[PDB]
Design a protein around this ligand. Sequence first.
Ligand SMILES: CCCCCCCCCCCCCCCCC[C@@H](O)O[C@H](CO[C@H](O)CCCCCCCCCCCCCCC)COP(=O)(O)OCC[N+](C)(C)C
Ligand SMILES: CCCCCCCC/C=C\CCCCCCCC(=O)O[C@H](COC(=O)CCCCCCC/C=C/CCCCCCCC)COP(=O)(O)OCCN
Lengths: 69, 83
Amino acid sequence: IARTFYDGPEKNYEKTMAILQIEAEKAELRLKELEVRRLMRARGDGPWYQYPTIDKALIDHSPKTTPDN
Amino acid sequence: AGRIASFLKNAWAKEPVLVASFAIGGLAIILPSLSPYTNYAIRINRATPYNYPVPLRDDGNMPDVPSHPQDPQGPSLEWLKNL
Ligand SMILES: CCCCCCCCCCCCCCCCC[C@@H](O)O[C@H](CO[C@H](O)CCCCCCCCCCCCCCC)COP(=O)(O)OCC[N+](C)(C)C
Ligand SMILES: CCCCCCCC/C=C\CCCCCCCC(=O)O[C@H](COC(=O)CCCCCCC/C=C/CCCCCCCC)COP(=O)(O)OCCN
């Protein structure tokens, strides 16, 4: 029965080791992502949570018919 | 091109006001494209000095910029005097 239907215990051992490693990395990545999102929403200096401003190319730098401006 | 003549004759006999209005509207739509005087009107509009011409600082590399209003350089309005 063992020869025909099942395998050795080392197979399951190493499989669950790999599964545990994968899940641990995923958990760490999730926590790091939450922290990064919080920090970049608070500060706004990151790529995410960038809100549009007024483009400076719309300004007209020419004489305005009055000397002051 | 045969039935349209009869339609035009019937319209002129029955409702000349609409015929005249449509003719005037079409004429006003088409003609300004073919008129060579539109560019003259645009140039006349562009040649009207509403605001002050601000002088340019001389850096020594402006051959096409006059140093005085009576200098030969710069735009000329002689074409307007003959129009
Ligand atoms: C010796 C006589 C006295 C003792 C009798 C003992 C009775 C034991 C027989 C009863 C069998 C119990 C059913 C359990 C089936 C397990 C299914 C699965 O686990 O097996 C897979 C494969 O299946 C097996 O080949 C068996 C499949 C056969 C299904 C049994 C059905 C027989 C019922 C009879 C039906 C009769 C129909 C009549 C029609 C009219 C294994 O997957 P695999 O990853 O590949 O192999 C891993 C191991 N390796 C790598 C070393 C090779
Ligand atoms: C894309 C070009 C547009 C610019 C030109 C037009 C500018 C504005 C002029 C149009 C104003 C609105 C016109 C509204 C049209 C209404 C037509 C209509 O349905 O009235 C009919 C009557 O009108 C008609 O007969 C049908 C259409 C008649 C001809 C309409 C114009 C066809 C083209 C005429 C000019 C062709 C080009 C000029 C050639 C000049 C000759 C060399 C109903 O008659 P009632 O008075 O209500 O009742 C009568 C019974 N008691």
